[PDB]
Amino acid sequence: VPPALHLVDPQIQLTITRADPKVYPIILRLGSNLSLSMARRNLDSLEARAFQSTPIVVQMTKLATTEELPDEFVVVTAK
Amino acid sequence: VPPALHLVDPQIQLTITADPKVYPIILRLGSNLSLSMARRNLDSLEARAFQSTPIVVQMTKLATTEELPDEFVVVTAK
Numbered sequence: 105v106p107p108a109l110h111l112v113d114p115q116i117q118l119t120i121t122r123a124d125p126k127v128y129p130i131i132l133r134l135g136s137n138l139s140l141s142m143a144r145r146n147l148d149s150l151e152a153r154a155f156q157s158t159p160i161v162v163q164m165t166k167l168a169t170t171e172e173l174p175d176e177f178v179v180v181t182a183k
Numbered sequence: 184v185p186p187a188l189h190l191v192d193p194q195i196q197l198t199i200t201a202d203p204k205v206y207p208i209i210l211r212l213g214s215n216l217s218l219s220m221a222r223r224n225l226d227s228l229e230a231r232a233f234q235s236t237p238i239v240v241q242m243t244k245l246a247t248t249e250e251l252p253d254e255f256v257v258v259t260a261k
């Protein structure tokens with residue numbers, strides 16, 4: 105079965121740069137599933153994790169019709 | 184068998200809403216991911232509904248954890 109296309113909400117989008125523009129929503133060709141987390145330096149202790157990992161909630165949407173998409177967007181071929 | 188940390192350059196970064204910011208990307212790639220830019224084919228009808236142009240990721244492999252930003256997002260690539 106071909107890895108149905110998933111729309112990652114505008115909440116989260118990519119930013120490619122030159123000049124300054126370019127913010128494309130995200131599409132997933134998820135074969136294997138991807139995990140996303142937020143990390144931050146541990147600058148107030150030295151027995152605590154070097155970095156603080158806070159898993160991130162991806163509210164991506166599964167799609168049925170290609171008409172729901174925008175003219176340009178990035179596609180994470182989950183390869 | 185791995186995974187090593189890979190820093191995806193500034194060129195490419197994730198983003199969040201309104202005044203909000205961007206975070207560089209780190210990969211715990213299990214599988215080596217592919218990325219591509221797509222576009223609707225609004226001037227034709229015989230060539231792909233969308234323009235898939237594979238995208239070049241200039242990510243860097245990290246040796247030290249000291250090279251990392253204070254904040255950032257990690258894509259644990261299962």
Ligand SMILES: CCCCCCCCCC
Binds near residue numbers: 180
């Ligand atoms: C689970 C959401 C993963 C989205 C991050 C995609 C980063 C680009 C890898 C090429």
